[PDB]
């Protein structure tokens, strides 16, 4: 258990935003750069 706990902590990562998820009008820079939607998981 102690061997695997550190790797388990290190591998618990959250996935990026989905492709069809808009970026709101609060970013104000990516919105002005025509960068409206998130890239995706790629």
């Amino acid at each position: 258990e102690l061997l695997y706990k550190q790797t388990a902590i290190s591998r618990a990562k959250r996935a990026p935003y989905p492709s069809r998820m808009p970026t709101g009008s609060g970013n104000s820079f990516a919105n002005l750069n025509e960068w409206h939607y998130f890239p995706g998981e790629q």
Partner: protein
């Protein structure tokens, strides 16, 4: 000498009214440009930031209401003067 006095007066006037000017500028930027006043310490990460405004219709309604009632200056003659005393000035 004259320039120094003028600049001293201007500096006093500018400093005496700083908070009101800053808050008015903040209000103008919030109402017109955007509602996320986080320009400082931004760009560290990218996250969703929506803008669901609810206050803009109130401002629109108020400006429409005061646009429907124009107001101008009406010069009237003084009580001791002639009845037609403010009629060339009114025409001008």
């Amino acid at each position: 000498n004259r320039l120094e006095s003028i600049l001293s007066r201007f500096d006093a006037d500018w400093t005496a009214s700083d908070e009101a000017r800053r808050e008015a500028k903040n209000d103008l930027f919030f109402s017109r440009v955007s509602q996320w006043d986080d320009w400082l310490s931004q760009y560290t990460t990218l996250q969703y930031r929506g803008q669901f405004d609810v206050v803009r219709p109130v401002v629109r309604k108020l400006v429409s209401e005061m646009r429907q009632n124009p107001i101008d200056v009406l010069y009237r003659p003084k009580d001791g003067a002639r009845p037609d005393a403010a009629d060339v000035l009114m025409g001008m």
